Amino acid sequence: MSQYSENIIIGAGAAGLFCAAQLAKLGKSVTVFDNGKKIGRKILMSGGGFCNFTNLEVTPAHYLSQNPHFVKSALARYTNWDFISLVAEQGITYHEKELGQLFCDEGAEQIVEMLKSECDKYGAKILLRSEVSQVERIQNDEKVRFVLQVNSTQWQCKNLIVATGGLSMPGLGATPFGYQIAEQFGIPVIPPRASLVPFTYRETDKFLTALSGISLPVTITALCGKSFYNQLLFTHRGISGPAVLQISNYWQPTESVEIDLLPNHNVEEEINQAKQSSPKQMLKTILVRLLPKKLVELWIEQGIVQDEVIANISKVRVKNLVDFIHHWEFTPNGTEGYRTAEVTMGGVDTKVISSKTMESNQVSGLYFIGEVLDVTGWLGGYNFQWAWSSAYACALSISRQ
Ligand SMILES: Cc1cc2nc3c(=O)[nH]c(=O)nc-3n(C[C@H](O)[C@H](O)[C@H](O)COP(=O)(O)OP(=O)(O)OC[C@H]3O[C@@H](n4cnc5c(N)ncnc54)[C@H](O)[C@@H]3O)c2cc1C
Q1: Which end of the chain, N or C, is less packed with Cβ atoms under 10 Å?
Q2: How far is the CA of 45 from the centre of ligand 1 (A)?
Q3: Domains of the chain, first to last
Q4: Would you say 344 and 317 are in contact if contact means Cβ atoms under 8 Å apart?
């Protein structure tokens, strides 16, 4: 057996499925291989089961990359609105959760269903339980530029689109195959790291484990200056939540994070209003009215915060408390693994890839789309949008040959 398909796609995920659909729709033959048992396994998990498919405010600045000028082209070619429009026209209902985030009303199944439907509608063939391996480059054959082993059959193609994703969720089928193919052809890869992931506590902060389950709004600021205002969640392992997941993109191993527990109010102003309006009251009572009761109690049960009458508090101790709550210098021991991480930072170096095409500069006929590229977006549907955009730029480019 020796099959052929002008276009082969490795990975039946967000980027793979969408690209396969665009190609069939533009009238090109394409086959998709996937080591998994079902298509779009991560799409089904995204957005807590409803799929945060994009965000109303998308710009290149919502993406992390060694190469800042990369993302702009594909994002402007196929926009968040081009997809929002495809979704609505496709009969899918969605709503805005917060911060421009858009989710499906009827679950992530809608997105996966729409993708699989477009592919069936235009001719794309999807083969599951097919793990790709042994990719070889062919040089003389004008019709065959690549050969590869899928199970026991050898496939041949003119264009090979790599949409294998990143490393998070290994139990879901995640593979480094995309990087392995790149490295085999001498294509540079930026060292991958788990991102949009929780932080783990060092020994000195382990006592905060007692706060597990508690949640509050804070502002997290990374050493590079980036800030995010959102919810922070105390865990058994460390700290998590939207604010933490967001800042893990800008945080670097060995680095510290600046956490403001009371971003909202101006503690001193308040502590003073209570110093006049309640000279009798305890510090603990004024504090619990601002922060979670159990956190305030823990600082006390740890002797970190003295509980005295508002009146018996020197203006200097009031200013040390204020700085203490607004400037918590947190140094995580590290990050949780790829089993919790939402994405993977790093990947194929985007400077050797085409900004307009997604095609490899070093190896013609080889394309990289999706998360495998060194393009990581913010939490909030940005990662899926990059998948739609890069998959489209690739398909549109190939249809033009
Ligand atoms: C728990 C969780 C929740 C998430 N929620 C959101 C969200 O709400 N919004 C958002 O924008 N993003 C979200 N993401 C991230 C998002 O899923 C990805 O950024 C996006 O799916 C990347 O698309 P992709 O096609 O590159 O890869 P994937 O969607 O991962 O698909 C690639 C496929 O390639 C296949 N593959 C790998 N190696 C091989 C091989 N050797 N042979 C054949 N096939 C192979 C895999 O089976 C995989 O299914 C979430 C991620 C996780 C883990």
Answers
A1: N
A2: 10
A3: 2-192+344-401 (3.50.50.60), 193-265+327-343 (2.40.30.10), 266-326 (1.10.8.260)
A4: no
Backbone angles phi, psi at 40, to 5 degrees: 40, 55
Q: How far is CA 315 from CA 269, 271, 310, 351, in A?
A: 12, 10, 11, 55
Ligand 1 atom closest to Cα of 381? Answer: 11
CB under 6 Å to ligand 1: residues? 10-16, 33-36, 41-42, 45-47, 52, 131-132, 163-165, 168-169, 173, 175, 177, 342-343, 370-372, 381-384, 387
Query: What resolution (Å)?
Result: 2.7
Kindly give the distance from the C-alpha atom of residue 387 to the centroid of ligand 1, in angstroms, as a whole number. 9
How far apart CA 83 and CA 102 sit, in angstroms, is 11
- Residue 91 is labelled as binding a ligand: no
**Rounded distance from Cα 214 to ligand 1 centre (Å):** 30
d(CA 178, CA 353): 14
